[PDB]
Amino acid sequence: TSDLIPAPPLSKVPLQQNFQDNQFQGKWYVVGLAGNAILREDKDPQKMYATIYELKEDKSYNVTSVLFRKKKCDYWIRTFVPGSQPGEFTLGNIKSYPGLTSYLVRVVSTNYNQHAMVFFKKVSQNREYFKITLYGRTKELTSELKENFIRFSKSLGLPENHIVFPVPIDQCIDG
Numbered sequence: 001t002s003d004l005i006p007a008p009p010l011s012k013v014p015l016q017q018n019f020q021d022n023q024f025q026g027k028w029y030v031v032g033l034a035g036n037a038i039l040r041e042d043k044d045p046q047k048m049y050a051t052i053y054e055l056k057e058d059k060s061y062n063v064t065s066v067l068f069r070k071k072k073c074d075y076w077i078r079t080f081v082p083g084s085q086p087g088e089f090t091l092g093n094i095k096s097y098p099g100l101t102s103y104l105v106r107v108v109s110t111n112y113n114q115h116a117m118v119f120f121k122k123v124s125q126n127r128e129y130f131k132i133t134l135y136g137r138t139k140e141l142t143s144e145l146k147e148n149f150i151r152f153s154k155s156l157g158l159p160e161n162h163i164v165f166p167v168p169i170d171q172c173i174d175g
């Protein structure tokens, strides 16, 4: 069993206007992370990881996540397929993920060369999960951007213990 804070309606999740897919490319650090299955752990805090976006000829993204785990760099590859509006995506090859029936990505805000906020919603084993990432082009962002991210996370119904700021590291994510 399992008890989750409900996903917000999509009406509460803004979309970046005039989204520019070419400018969103490249490496983003995960400076903030919040969601209904994200929990602060002071015993063993979340380490920063990175996500690299590469725009393919057909305008899908190849999306590679890089995490430092058990002394090694762990890589995860996904495809984001353009959805109903620019800045919105669904997951490619969804059938290769057991239990997954739905996956949605919406770029909420970005200035492309410093920060972004991205919303994800998925249905897995019939459970609805959502998260929000605060991306930085660098490993640090201003207090202002972080407090905005906190405000936005709370507006989607998340309490403070479901909002995490991964600790900067140098392994793997400096690629």
Ligand SMILES: [Th+4]
Binding pocket: none
């Ligand atoms: Th995932």
